[PDB]
Design a protein around this ligand. Structure first.
Ligand code: PRO
Ligand code: PRO
Ligand SMILES: [Ca+2]
Ligand SMILES: [Ca+2]
Lengths: 237, 237
């Protein structure tokens, strides 16, 4: 009997996570498409900054990212659509992670989590390189608000038994219902758990918890789901 | 015993279809985002046709749709990125369904299936209106190749027992492993089945088949899955 309910919880837990992994991969691919196309369109006239300014204020694009901008290699200037942020003499775009990563990889990248100079929160960014006839001209950032990412992974009913979260391949937390955890290794809130695909079962504070991880292939992110085993058992009802 | 295997086939069938519905809604939302942003960017200078031409040839955008173009209200001209098609004196963009629909609705639309003048296949299109300071200036099409749509819905292992397909809310087939069915009511290949969500069980040619439909809310499309019941039973193994 216990194994009857156990293998149905396990398998319903399988459902929700693979369902979430696909949803995250889709939204990620979608944001990457929007970023790639925006970059290519800016490359029609990459040093026409007035052009780039207008494009970044177009409403659908502007509303799809926390913030978008383009830093220039030659003059270290920034064209940017953040309504509550401007650079000053302490800011050089070329020293930033989205920029350095896009310059290094010479293609679209997704950064590690880092502190946003604007919101002062941990974020991630899509970074893209900008070319003028195969000369590197600068790079773009498309910032991703991580609490919105946490709402996205927690778009499934997890029996009301727990929650989902995301980590990098090194276990650095990317999304969590409590954003304070972003930027921390996940062992901070979920100790004695190894970062590996499959299911683990551990006790914490006198209760058992099921933990499921599923990899996101394209960025080697992990989707974590944690559920109170007892509440899970109940909430198949 | 039969009801034991039956309720697991039913529920695995539940999994795959809701999994597919979400995947279709995601890709649709993604294409709509790309189309909305492209239209808005063209609206920065809507009668600069040279500008629109360049944008539509940018590779990521061009590779995301079968074909993209913009027809103009004033002169009935077409800017268009189809490498194997040009209009002639028998073609007027303003009489086409993507155009008429976008003009009618005054927002982004997804057309009913219709015959593509270029490929001579049934397709669908995202249509968008183009404005110059709230005067209607023309409309855009973003064509969707339906066999690629059929590959997308059939991205799940359906036990090797059958296949998935898509219909409009009127049961007109939008995607099918055999594209010959596109544009036909689904009763052509799947008779005595009502178009409704849930599961039906019918006999055809001396075998029982399970049929699951799930609605796609945003366009009122239906995702159909058909499986040979016996093969389904086997292929949980
Ligand atoms: O932190 C950075 O470098 C970018 C630019 C402002 C918003 N995020
Ligand atoms: O059939 C039409 O009107 C559009 C334009 C060429 C491709 N599809
Ligand atoms: Ca600003
Ligand atoms: Ca052409």
């Amino acid at each position: 009997v216990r194994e009857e309910i156990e293998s149905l919880v396990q398998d319903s837990l399988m459902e929700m996570v693979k369902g979430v992994k696909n949803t995250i991969e889709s939204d990620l691919a979608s944001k990457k498409g929007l970023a790639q196309s925006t970059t290519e369109i800016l490359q029609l006239d990459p040093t026409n900054k007035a052009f780039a300014k207008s494009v970044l204020e177009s409403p659908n694009l502007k509303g799809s990212f926390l913030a978008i901008g383009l830093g220039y290699e030659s003059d270290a200037t920034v064209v940017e659509n953040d309504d509550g942020w401007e650079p000053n003499a302490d800011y050089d775009p070329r020293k930033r992670p989205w920029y350095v990563d896009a310059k290094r990889e010479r293609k679209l990248v997704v950064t590690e989590p880092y502190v946003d100079i604007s919101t002062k929160k941990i974020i991630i960014s899509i970074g893209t390189p900008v070319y003028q006839q195969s000369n590197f001209v600068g790079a773009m950032f498309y910032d991703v608000e991580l609490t919105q990412l946490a709402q996205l992974v927690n778009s499934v009913n997890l029996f009301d038994a727990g929650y989902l979260f995301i980590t990098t391949k090194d276990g650095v937390t990317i999304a969590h219902p409590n954003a304070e955890n972003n930027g921390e290794k996940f062992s901070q809130f979920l100790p004695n758990v190894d970062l590996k695909e499959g299911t683990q079962r551990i006790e914490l504070d006198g209760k058992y918890y099921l933990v499921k991880f599923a990899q996101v292939p394209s960025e080697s992110w992990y989707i974590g789901a944690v559920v109170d085993e007892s509440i899970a058992f109940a909430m198949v009802d």
